[PDB]
Amino acid sequence: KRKVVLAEQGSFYIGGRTVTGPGKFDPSKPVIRYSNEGATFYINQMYVNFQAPVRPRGLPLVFWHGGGLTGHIWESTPDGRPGFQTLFVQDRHTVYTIDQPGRGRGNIPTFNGPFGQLEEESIVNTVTGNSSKEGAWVRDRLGPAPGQFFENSQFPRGYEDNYFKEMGFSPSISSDEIVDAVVKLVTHIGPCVLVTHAASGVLGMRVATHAKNVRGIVAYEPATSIFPKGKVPEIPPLADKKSQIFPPFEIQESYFKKLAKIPIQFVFGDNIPKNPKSAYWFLDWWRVTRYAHSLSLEAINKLGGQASLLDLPTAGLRGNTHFPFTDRNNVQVASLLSDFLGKHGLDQN
Amino acid sequence: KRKVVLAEQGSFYIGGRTVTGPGKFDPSKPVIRYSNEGATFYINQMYVNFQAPVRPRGLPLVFWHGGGLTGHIWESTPDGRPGFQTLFVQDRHTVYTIDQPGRGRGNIPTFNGPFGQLEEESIVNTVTGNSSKEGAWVRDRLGPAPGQFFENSQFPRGYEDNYFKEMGFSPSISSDEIVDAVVKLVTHIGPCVLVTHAASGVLGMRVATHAKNVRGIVAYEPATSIFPKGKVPEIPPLADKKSQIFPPFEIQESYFKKLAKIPIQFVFGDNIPKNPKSAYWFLDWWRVTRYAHSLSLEAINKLGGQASLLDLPTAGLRGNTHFPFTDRNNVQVASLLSDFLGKHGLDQN
Ligand SMILES: CCOC(=O)c1ccccc1S(=O)(=O)NC(=O)Nc1nc(Cl)cc(OC)n1
Ligand SMILES: COc1cc(Cl)nc(NC(=O)NS(=O)(=O)c2ccccc2C(=O)O)n1
Numbered sequence: 001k002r003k004v005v006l007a008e009q010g011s012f013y014i015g016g017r018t019v020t021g022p023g024k025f026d027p028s029k030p031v032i033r034y035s036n037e038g039a040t041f042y043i044n045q046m047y048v049n050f051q052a053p054v055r056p057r058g059l060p061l062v063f064w065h066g067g068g069l070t071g072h073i074w075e076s077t078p079d080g081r082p083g084f085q086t087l088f089v090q091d092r093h094t095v096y097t098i099d100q101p102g103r104g105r106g107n108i109p110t111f112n113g114p115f116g117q118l119e120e121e122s123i124v125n126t127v128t129g130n131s132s133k134e135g136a137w138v139r140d141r142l143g144p145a146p147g148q149f150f151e152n153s154q155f156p157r158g159y160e161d162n163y164f165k166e167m168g169f170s171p172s173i174s175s176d177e178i179v180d181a182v183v184k185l186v187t188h189i190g191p192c193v194l195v196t197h198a199a200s201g202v203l204g205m206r207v208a209t210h211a212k213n214v215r216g217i218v219a220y221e222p223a224t225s226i227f228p229k230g231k232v233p234e235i236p237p238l239a240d241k242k243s244q245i246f247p248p249f250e251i252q253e254s255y256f257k258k259l260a261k262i263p264i265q266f267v268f269g270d271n272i273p274k275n276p277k278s279a280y281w282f283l284d285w286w287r288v289t290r291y292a293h294s295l296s297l298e299a300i301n302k303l304g305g306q307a308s309l310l311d312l313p314t315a316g317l318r319g320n321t322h323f324p325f326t327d328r329n330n331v332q333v334a335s336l337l338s339d340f341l342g343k344h345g346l347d348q349n
Numbered sequence: 350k351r352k353v354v355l356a357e358q359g360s361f362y363i364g365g366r367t368v369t370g371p372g373k374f375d376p377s378k379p380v381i382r383y384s385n386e387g388a389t390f391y392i393n394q395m396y397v398n399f400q401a402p403v404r405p406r407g408l409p410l411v412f413w414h415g416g417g418l419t420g421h422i423w424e425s426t427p428d429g430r431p432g433f434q435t436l437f438v439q440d441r442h443t444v445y446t447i448d449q450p451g452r453g454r455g456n457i458p459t460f461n462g463p464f465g466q467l468e469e470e471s472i473v474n475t476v477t478g479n480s481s482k483e484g485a486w487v488r489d490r491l492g493p494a495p496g497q498f499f500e501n502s503q504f505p506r507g508y509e510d511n512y513f514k515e516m517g518f519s520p521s522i523s524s525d526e527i528v529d530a531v532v533k534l535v536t537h538i539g540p541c542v543l544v545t546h547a548a549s550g551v552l553g554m555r556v557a558t559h560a561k562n563v564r565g566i567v568a569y570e571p572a573t574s575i576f577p578k579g580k581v582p583e584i585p586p587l588a589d590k591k592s593q594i595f596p597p598f599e600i601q602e603s604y605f606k607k608l609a610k611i612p613i614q615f616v617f618g619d620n621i622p623k624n625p626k627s628a629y630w631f632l633d634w635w636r637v638t639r640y641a642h643s644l645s646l647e648a649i650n651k652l653g654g655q656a657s658l659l660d661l662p663t664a665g666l667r668g669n670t671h672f673p674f675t676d677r678n679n680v681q682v683a684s685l686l687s688d689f690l691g692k693h694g695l696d697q698n
């Protein structure tokens with residue numbers, strides 16, 4: 001089960017643009033100096049890895065990490081078991097994994113000067129934000145509070161250090177430029193399936209409205225909902241009566257209707273409450289966010305779509321976290337993804 | 350020949366520490382906020398990838414990228430040919446590739462606040478530095494000035510954008526903490542060989558003085574020379590009679606002596622001038638830096654060592670850049686690395 005046979009593997013950079021400092025470069029002057037003089041910088045490019053099996057069947061899969069993550073989460077679980085990259089090469093799909101602009105091997109746009117600043121232009125903000133171990137613990141629903149685990153947890157307990165070390169900050173790159181890089185990738189590889197997670201959920205939906213080569217989407221616990229412009233349904237605030245979920249993204253209806261042309265599945269793990277929970281902000285946040293997504297999928301289906309919501313507990317899988325593809329039962333989670341691909345013929349040539 | 354059979358592959362995080370923000374975490378309060386309140390942050394951890402062949406022979410190889418780079422440079426060349434990772438898995442070595450702390454999938458230590466600042470504490474500097482395309486062009490000796498190639502160049506022309514997109518800034522993480530992470534990796538792996546490049550040259554030498562598991566070093570064009578404390582020889586300034594090379598790193602003789610106990614090879618490419626070249630700063634810089642390394646290797650041999658300098662043109666290979674392992678003749682470069690491993694018994698069990 002750890003063995004993998006690759007016809008080919010590799011990695012490359014795609015997307016991005018260039019920005020430039022003032023003046024001219026002189027090769028006789030000291031080159032190692034604090035200066036943007038005569039400088040050309042490549043910024044906002046994306047890193048892409050691929051592994052291809054011998055005799056691939058069906059469409060390539062593009063795995064797109066969630067917020068603050070990298071392609072590592074598709075490579076291995078925190079306790080060292082095979083990730084979805086290995087599992088789906090074994091399932092005879094070519095597999096692409098990316099580090100989006102601003103994350104991991106993607107570009108972080110900084111120069112000579114305060115972070116993110118190229119002379120007078122602010123490419124990204126100098127002030128950053130970042131989550132904590134404690135924030136990530138409850139965001140990911142390991143348990144209701146740091147140090148605590150829900151009863152039938154599929155988290156790989158004992159490997160907390162490995163898990164939280166994989167997370168980090170994102171600079172303030174425009175979401176337009178992240179979408180642009182993946183649109184370019186989808187043009188490059190041809191017909192494919194996007195497999196997204198959390199923060200890349202809404203970005204993958206946006207990519208699909210720009211790229212007909214996206215033939216299906218599976219999104220693990222997407223973080224932001226998407227609706228036709230001006231048609232966002234009423235969404236309640238959280239139980240604290242003061243907080244709200246992420247403002248839904250709105251796109252013009254002519255683009256939204258492209259989401260009705262491909263199969264789309266949103267997958268949710270366990271321990272999302274049915275009723276308000278004022279004591280546990282992130283549990284309540286997930287309740288209302290999942291509700292918003294159910295309305296988003298309904299709007300897609302009313303336009304002729306093929307969108308569905310899969311709650312892993314309804315499929316017989318209990319205890320999954322916000323990362324079902326690295327949980328202890330990730331092989332069973334992968335089996336459900338294979339089922340989706342097979343149902344729609346995305347595993348056949 | 351692109352096919353690769355892996356007994357196993359994966360990745361993991363290792364090394365690093367934690368820093369903590371003020372106060373306590375309350376799961377009832379909004380978790381997504383501009384605050385380090387109650388926050389634990391994992392910082393300065395390293396990303397590690399591994400690919401193991403069936404029936405490995407000899408010691409595992411740890412490939413360590415140069416300055417501003419990532420493990421991508423061992424995966425593929427800019428024009429998409431197999432990198433040393435593939436070539437040496439095919440050569441029946443287990444291959445580790447790393448993204449060191451502060452680069453790629455390694456941690457970049459920043460929080461909520463100005464880049465690198467945790468409340469009143471500066472973990473890394475807010476002001477960054479970075480090379481340009483122009484500076485990298487002449488540092489890497491593609492040619493004497495940006496956009497110009499040496500006639501004999503082994504660079505994969507036409508893939509310049511791909512090449513420069515792989516480079517980025519590094520935050521001011523202490524070199525001690527980078528060495529510490531690799532020492533911990535070497536402890537985990539067991540006996541191994543370090544293959545370093547440019548900025549990681551001096552760091553790999555330091556790791557070997559702390560880790561008897563390092564059984565050999567091959568360094569491609571190391572950037573900083575190393576000497577016993579108080580025994581730095583006379584090194585001239587550059588031809589401009591103003592600039593100097595990087596100040597040599599000095600270590601205790603009792604640690605320096607450990608470098609005499611393992612085989613060490615420094616590898617240099619082509620187009621490094623023999624005589625002073627005041628018109629081309631980085632060509633002259635490489636002349637004096639290579640000279641300093643010659644004296645460093647001499648110092649190791651006078652302690653009973655086996656340290657050698659391989660100039661690729663003397664082996665019949667002409668035109669190599671600062672990245673010989675991604676140049677057009679990188680298969681021939683790899684053959685010379687296999688020759689070194691075989692002479693010293695590092696390719697047998
Ligand atoms: C006219 C050719 O198209 C391009 O210019 C182009 C476009 C987008 C990304 C990369 C390239 S590229 O060629 O500069 N490089 C690649 O195509 N890279 C690449 N490298 C690997 Cl190792 C694999 C791959 O696709 C599987 N693609
Ligand atoms: C957890 O605690 C904190 C603290 C602070 Cl300051 N910022 C964040 N931001 C995110 O988690 N941003 S997200 O983009 O990864 C994301 C958000 C909601 C739900 C999911 C995700 C996610 O992609 O995993 N989380």
Ligand SMILES: COc1cc(Cl)nc(NC(=O)NS(=O)(=O)c2ccccc2C(=O)O)n1
Pocket residue numbers: 031032033034035112415416417478479480481484485488546547548549572
């Ligand atoms: C090229 O032009 C500029 C401009 C500025 Cl501001 N800073 C740098 N820094 C480096 O290249 N730093 S290095 O660490 O990668 C390195 C240095 C010398 C020789 C080799 C390397 C190297 O690792 O490849 N280069």
Ligand SMILES: [Ca+2]
Pocket residue numbers: 198199200201202203222223224225
């Ligand atoms: Ca989302």
